Amino acid sequence: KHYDYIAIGGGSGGIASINRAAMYGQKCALIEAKELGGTCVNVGCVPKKVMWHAAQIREAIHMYGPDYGFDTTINKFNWETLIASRTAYIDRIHTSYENVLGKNNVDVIKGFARFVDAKTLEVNGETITADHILIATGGRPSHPDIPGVEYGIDSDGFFALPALPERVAVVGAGYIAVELAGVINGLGAKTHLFVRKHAPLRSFDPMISETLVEVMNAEGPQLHTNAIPKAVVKNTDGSLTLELEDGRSETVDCLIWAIGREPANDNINLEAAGVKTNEKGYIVVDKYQNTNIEGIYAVGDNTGAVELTPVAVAAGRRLSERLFNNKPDEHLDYSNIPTVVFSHPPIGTVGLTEPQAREQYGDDQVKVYKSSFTAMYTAVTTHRQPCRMKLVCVGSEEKIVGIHGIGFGMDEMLQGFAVALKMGATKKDFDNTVAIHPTAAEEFVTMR
Amino acid sequence: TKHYDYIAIGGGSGGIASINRAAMYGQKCALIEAKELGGTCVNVGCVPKKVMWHAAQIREAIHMYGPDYGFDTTINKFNWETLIASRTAYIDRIHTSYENVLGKNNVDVIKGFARFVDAKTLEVNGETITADHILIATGGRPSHPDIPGVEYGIDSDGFFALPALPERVAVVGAGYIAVELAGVINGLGAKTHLFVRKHAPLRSFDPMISETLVEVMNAEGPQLHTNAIPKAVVKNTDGSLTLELEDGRSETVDCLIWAIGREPANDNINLEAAGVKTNEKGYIVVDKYQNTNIEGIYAVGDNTGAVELTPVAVAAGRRLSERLFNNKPDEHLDYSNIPTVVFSHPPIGTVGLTEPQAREQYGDDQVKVYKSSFTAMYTAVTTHRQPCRMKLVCVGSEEKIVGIHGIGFGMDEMLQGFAVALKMGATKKDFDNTVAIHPTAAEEFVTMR
Ligand SMILES: Cc1cc2nc3c(=O)[nH]c(=O)nc-3n(C[C@H](O)[C@H](O)[C@H](O)COP(=O)(O)OP(=O)(O)OC[C@H]3O[C@@H](n4cnc5c(N)ncnc54)[C@H](O)[C@@H]3O)c2cc1C
Numbered sequence: 014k015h016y017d018y019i020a021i022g023g024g025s026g027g028i029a030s031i032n033r034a035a036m037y038g039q040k041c042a043l044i045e046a047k048e049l050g051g052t053c054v055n056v057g058c059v060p061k062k063v064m065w066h067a068a069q070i071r072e073a074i075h076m077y078g079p080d081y082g083f084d085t086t087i088n089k090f091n092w093e094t095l096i097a098s099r100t101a102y103i104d105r106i107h108t109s110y111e112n113v114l115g116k117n118n119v120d121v122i123k124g125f126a127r128f129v130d131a132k133t134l135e136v137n138g139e140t141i142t143a144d145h146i147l148i149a150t151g152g153r154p155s156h157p158d159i160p161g162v163e164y165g166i167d168s169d170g171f172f173a174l175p176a177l178p179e180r181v182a183v184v185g186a187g188y189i190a191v192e193l194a195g196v197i198n199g200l201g202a203k204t205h206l207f208v209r210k211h212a213p214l215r216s217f218d219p220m221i222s223e224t225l226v227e228v229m230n231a232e233g234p235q236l237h238t239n240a241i242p243k244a245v246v247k248n249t250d251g252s253l254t255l256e257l258e259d260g261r262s263e264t265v266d267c268l269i270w271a272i273g274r275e276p277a278n279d280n281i282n283l284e285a286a287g288v289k290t291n292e293k294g295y296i297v298v299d300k301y302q303n304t305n306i307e308g309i310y311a312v313g314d315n316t317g318a319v320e321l322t323p324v325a326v327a328a329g330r331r332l333s334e335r336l337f338n339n340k341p342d343e344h345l346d347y348s349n350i351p352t353v354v355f356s357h358p359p360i361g362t363v364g365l366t367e368p369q370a371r372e373q374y375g376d377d378q379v380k381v382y383k384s385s386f387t388a389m390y391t392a393v394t395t396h397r398q399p400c401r402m403k404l405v406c407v408g409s410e411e412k413i414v415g416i417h418g419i420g421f422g423m424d425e426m427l428q429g430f431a432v433a434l435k436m437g438a439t440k441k442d443f444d445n446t447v448a449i450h451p452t453a454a455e456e457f458v459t460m461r
Numbered sequence: 462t463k464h465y466d467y468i469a470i471g472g473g474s475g476g477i478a479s480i481n482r483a484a485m486y487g488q489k490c491a492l493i494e495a496k497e498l499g500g501t502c503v504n505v506g507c508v509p510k511k512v513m514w515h516a517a518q519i520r521e522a523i524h525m526y527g528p529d530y531g532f533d534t535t536i537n538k539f540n541w542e543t544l545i546a547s548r549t550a551y552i553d554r555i556h557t558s559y560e561n562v563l564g565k566n567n568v569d570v571i572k573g574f575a576r577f578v579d580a581k582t583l584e585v586n587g588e589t590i591t592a593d594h595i596l597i598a599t600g601g602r603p604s605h606p607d608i609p610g611v612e613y614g615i616d617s618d619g620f621f622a623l624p625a626l627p628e629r630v631a632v633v634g635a636g637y638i639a640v641e642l643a644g645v646i647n648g649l650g651a652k653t654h655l656f657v658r659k660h661a662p663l664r665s666f667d668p669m670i671s672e673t674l675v676e677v678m679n680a681e682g683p684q685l686h687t688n689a690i691p692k693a694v695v696k697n698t699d700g701s702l703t704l705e706l707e708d709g710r711s712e713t714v715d716c717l718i719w720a721i722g723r724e725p726a727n728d729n730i731n732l733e734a735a736g737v738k739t740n741e742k743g744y745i746v747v748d749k750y751q752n753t754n755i756e757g758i759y760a761v762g763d764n765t766g767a768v769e770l771t772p773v774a775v776a777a778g779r780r781l782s783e784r785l786f787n788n789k790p791d792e793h794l795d796y797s798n799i800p801t802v803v804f805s806h807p808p809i810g811t812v813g814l815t816e817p818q819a820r821e822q823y824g825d826d827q828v829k830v831y832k833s834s835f836t837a838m839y840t841a842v843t844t845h846r847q848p849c850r851m852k853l854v855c856v857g858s859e860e861k862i863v864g865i866h867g868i869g870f871g872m873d874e875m876l877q878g879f880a881v882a883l884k885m886g887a888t889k890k891d892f893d894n895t896v897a898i899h900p901t902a903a904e905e906f907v908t909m910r
């Protein structure tokens with residue numbers, strides 16, 4: 014069959030790009046092997062946030078609630094009810110996505126696709142061809158090459174757990190490790206986080222990882238630093254012992270690898286299309302998402318860019334705008350992309366860290382504003398939690414180049430401040446907006 | 462007679478902020494407060510109100526959402542005395558740090574009701590004190606209806622002194638405080654009733670907000686009674702009160718809260734002697750720079766009839782001390798586009814014009830509205846799903862954003878940044894060019910279609 018545009022992968026980039034293109038008169042087909050929505054709807058963003066919410070509820074009941082007057086008994090935590098509720102929600106999401114593509118006249122082909130040549134793909138026996146092909150195949154979890162690695166599960170295995178384990182070890186030191194560790198500890202399991210060096214999120218502003226370690230030390234997960242995994246030993250009773258290179262070891266009932274992800278560009282026969290990947294397996298793309306072959310583009314996690322659903326969506330829309338809506342210089346700007354980590358407490362960050370700004374502009378040009386305070390929600394309890402916020406400003410005008418914060422509210426408050434950052438806000442612009450009281454967000458417009 | 466360079470009457474929000482900024486620049490100051498430092502905000506407003514909103518968030522987490530996330534929970538006892546004790550200890554620690562800052566700033570705090578003897582002289586506790594500049598930041602107080610039985614009702618100060626949570630509560634009113642108190646008492650488990658005189662509460666807010674707020678009320682409390690004009694409150698033999706309404710309906714409850722407005726506390730300080738003019742409602746009349754008609758007397762805050770928010774008092778007070786004492790002759794607060802959050806259920810966030818106001822002011826042909834409605838994710842996996850509804854109001858070819866309105870979980874915290882953007886003159890294009898943050902409720906304003 015012949016289509017004007019085919020996207021391989023019904024994850025964030027594929028779906029976004031094919032719907033914008035179907036809007037401009039194009040005949041499109043989306044191909045997906047597993048479920049619509051990709052990592053984000055199925056084993057990523059949506060199910061992670063439901064599980065963050067379950068943890069926040071258990072913490073209100075068990076940690077904070079007592080000091081607010083509530084003497085409560087959790088009679089039963091039914092893991093089955095929670096997973097049946099998250100699954101029903103995701104099934105409603107699948108049906109919505111189906112309806113949108115249907116409205117758009119996109120032909121959805123369920124099956125695994127592989128290249129025959131630069132303009133042809135084989136899917137379920139059938140051959141389909143198109144003048145433009147988007148590869149948006151995403152990624153998959155990495156696993157250390159050590160003895161016993163197959164005893165651990167990864168973040169996809171986390172979403173399939175039949176019950177909450179008593180003792181869990183999470184290995185890794187980036188976003189996924191920090192969030193899964195935080196959720197699982199929040200839901201009651203004895204939780205350990207093993208990181209290789211001094212702290213998790215070592216690339217984030219120093220304030221953020223220094224504060225996360227503080228919270229961890231007060232309320233869990235138990236953090237272990239300088240921890241290089243050597244081997245996992247399954248024991249007689251069925252538990253696992255993670256052995257570390259320095260001699261330390263820990264026995265758990267479950268071990269989750271959260272050590273990075275890797276592109277899923279391999280069994281699709283790129284060689285036949287002539288598309289080049291780099292040393293790490295990512296499809297190499299330019300500014301405009303073009304591969305080296307004319308007529309083939311890539312967006313998303315499979316290109317090595319920052320792995321976030323909104324980046325994949327925005328690059329994918331702009332791509333269909335360039336191609337099918339005659340906007341030749343249209344493309345995504347990958348700087349000042351806002352991030353929120355759903356840790357305990359949430360992290361919100363956009364723009365440069367203070368080390369980055371002091372390297373790029375020099376100490377003499379950088380002015381930093383910091384605020385540290387107890388989140389009000391916790392201030393009336395014996396489990397008080399810091400909130401810490403930082404503005405990084407450059408030049409006499411104190412143009413704002415990075416906004417960082419960690420504490421309750423960082424999740425919802427960051428977006429509007431990113432718009433502001435994008436417009437070129439200065440300290441004065443923040444300062445001349447009237448605060449909203451009582452909120453945490455108002456601390457960014459009243460820093461002194 | 463001691464003479465000061467600056468004296469504030471009122472140690473609430475405008476008074477503490479203006480006096481501290483003045484002391485920073487070398488002025489010898491005195492703050493006069495008749496009751497407790499921090500005023501309405503710290504003691505019977507902002508701070509205890511949010512502590513009580515969090516306690517409602519917690520009971521609703523245990524009782525309403527918890528079950529569908531699999532937590533089978535039993536509240537063995539809800540101890541009101543513990544909650545009130547933690548709330549009070551937090552307000553005492555706040556009194557202590559204000560005294561700490563005023564003390565570092567060498568401000569003389571005098572405790573007592575002050576009254577003007579003439580334009581430059583004040584009497585407080587038998588002593589006469591004089592100053593070159595005087596700030597009147599006296600605030601306001603609850604208004605009460607003029608109907609038989611009014612004294613059986615309490616108001617918002619009384620709500621913060623309740624010795625226990627009543628089983629049946631009536632809240633009468635349709636503003637911020639009635640919507641807040643009524644959703645808190647309802648969230649805390651009491652059979653709650655809201656009585657409004659016309660068709661909906663918050664009738665001055667964008668219609669989408671009052672419309673959605675009624676939807677939620679009908680689905681999960683408080684029980685809302687529209688077209689309700691109070692006629693009388695009967696104290697009954699068994700202790701309960703019966704609110705009777707003009708059209709004949711009545712309701713028996715154990716506690717009734719008047720939340721019908723506030724009025725300025727400008728009347729007992731002998732303004733006549735100083736010569737200060739007030740308006741027909743009793744507010745002190747001020748210009749753009751917080752000046753009264755008497756040279757060297759200024760007022761900020763709720764006693765001026767400007768929008769009654771703690772940050773507006775604080776910002777006008779701080780900027781007034783910049784103008785008088787730090788050489789910025791044109792320093793003044795711009796009262797437009799001031800952001801508000803109502804801590805209702807769900808929160809409301811709003812800034813700029815409503816859709817009716819933008820269509821009146823710019824004409825229908827110039828106004829473009831974007832809307833978005835979804836279920837809040839926290840609730841979408843439960844059998845108690847709540848809407849989130851968001852609106853952007855734009856004008857002209859450029860689609861300059863003149864209003865941002867929303868009601869839904871996350872509106873309390875997400876609004877501050879967007880208000881900085883509106884202030885900067887953002888258009889829809891600028892919102893659309895920022896990369897969303899997923900999964901949040903906030904991202905909806907940058908992906909609106
Ligand atoms: C645990 C976890 C948490 C995350 N949380 C967040 C978060 O809260 N916020 C955030 O912004 N980001 C989050 N992310 C990242 C986010 O999920 C990704 O950045 C995003 O999904 C990338 O979109 P994509 O289109 O590149 O790939 P994906 O969504 O991974 O989609 C790729 C799709 O292609 C399909 N496919 C692959 N090859 C073929 C083929 N040859 N034929 C047919 N079908 C094929 C796959 O089945 C899959 O559905 C998270 C990731 C993980 C794993």
Ligand SMILES: Cc1cc2nc3c(=O)[nH]c(=O)nc-3n(C[C@H](O)[C@H](O)[C@H](O)COP(=O)(O)OP(=O)(O)OC[C@H]3O[C@@H](n4cnc5c(N)ncnc54)[C@H](O)[C@@H]3O)c2cc1C
Pocket residue numbers: 449450451470471472473474475476493494495496497499500501502505506507508510573574575576598599600601617638726730761762763764768769770771772774
């Ligand atoms: C229930 C409730 C909830 C609220 N919630 C919020 C909210 O969340 N966010 C928000 O921004 N706003 C809120 N507000 C409004 C806010 O509290 C007021 O806008 C704010 O406190 C006004 O500050 P002010 O300095 O004008 O006066 P006030 O805080 O009222 O203080 C004036 C002070 O003057 C003192 N006084 C009066 N006359 C004299 C005298 N002659 N001599 C000496 N002392 C005197 C009084 O004792 C008082 O301490 C709320 C109000 C209420 C009642």
Ligand SMILES: NC(=O)c1ccc[n+]([C@@H]2O[C@H](COP(=O)([O-])OP(=O)(O)OC[C@H]3O[C@@H](n4cnc5c(N)ncnc54)[C@H](OP(=O)(O)O)[C@@H]3O)[C@@H](O)[C@H]2O)c1
Pocket residue numbers: 157184185186187188189190192208209210215242271272273274319320321352353354355
């Ligand atoms: N809410 C969100 O925005 C969100 C949430 C989750 C994921 N995502 C995205 O998905 C991307 C990939 O996720 P990820 O967190 O798995 O990868 P990641 O961010 O690259 O973090 C993995 C980290 O684990 C450590 N590590 C690597 N090998 C290790 C090993 N052998 N043993 C122990 N530790 C090892 C490294 O840190 P050290 O060098 O310090 O050891 C590495 O930086 C993220 O970068 C993010 O963009 C987004």
Ligand SMILES: NC(=O)c1ccc[n+]([C@@H]2O[C@H](COP(=O)([O-])OP(=O)(O)OC[C@H]3O[C@@H](n4cnc5c(N)ncnc54)[C@H](OP(=O)(O)O)[C@@H]3O)[C@@H](O)[C@H]2O)c1
Pocket residue numbers: 450606633634635636637638639641657658659663664690691720721722723768769770771801802803804
């Ligand atoms: N979010 C915040 O920052 C916050 C929170 C709380 C309070 N505050 C401030 O404090 C101020 C005062 O709040 P408020 O709620 O007390 O007053 P309000 O906002 O003026 O609202 C009271 C409403 O009560 C109704 N009403 C008046 N007389 C009535 C009567 N006799 N019987 C029944 N209903 C009657 C009127 O609405 P109808 O005409 O529709 O009946 C009136 O608009 C607010 O304006 C606000 O600025 C701020």
